[PDB]
Ligand binder design. Sequence first.
Ligand SMILES: CC(=O)Nc1ccc(S(=O)(=O)N2CCN(C(=O)c3cc(O)c(O)c(O)c3)CC2)cc1
Ligand SMILES: [Mn+2]
Ligand SMILES: [Mn+2]
Ligand SMILES: [Zn+2]
Length: 146
Amino acid sequence: GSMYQLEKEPIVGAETFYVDGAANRETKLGKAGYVTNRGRQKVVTLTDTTNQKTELQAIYLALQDSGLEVNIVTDSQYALGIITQWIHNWKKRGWKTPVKNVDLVNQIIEQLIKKEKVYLAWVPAHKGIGGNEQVDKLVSAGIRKV
Ligand SMILES: CC(=O)Nc1ccc(S(=O)(=O)N2CCN(C(=O)c3cc(O)c(O)c(O)c3)CC2)cc1
Ligand SMILES: [Mn+2]
Ligand SMILES: [Mn+2]
Ligand SMILES: [Zn+2]
């Protein structure tokens, strides 16, 4: 019962977007973006933003620049949770919409329901040479020390 059933496993064959965002509390400066396993990449700079906002902004960018079937890998538990919860709880009784970032999550759900299939997965932030590590370096540049 939702406006969409998110996939339970990654969509085989589909481009994978490793999304990430980072923000500085003291300046409200931040960056959001993605790298994909087909060579794509994009990073945007943001103002008046938060860390949880930039993570949502990266997911929005991934949905805007992807095809009808997309795999999205985030290290943001909040981003995954608030999107999955919004999907799972609709047109039902005891649903109070989130307070903060309500406009951003709304625009994300807008893009989401326009897709064939979407797989959204959480991974812990980690070190290495994988997708989450590359996009982290791109969005942390000038925002936070690595
Ligand atoms: C309330 C509760 O109990 N837990 C809870 C609540 C919110 C979150 S969080 O919103 O996901 N938050 C976790 C700490 N951060 C990173 O560690 C991080 C690491 C990165 O490498 C990175 O690229 C990145 O964008 C962020 C920022 C994001 C996590 C757990
Ligand atoms: Mn992240
Ligand atoms: Mn990171
Ligand atoms: Zn400003």
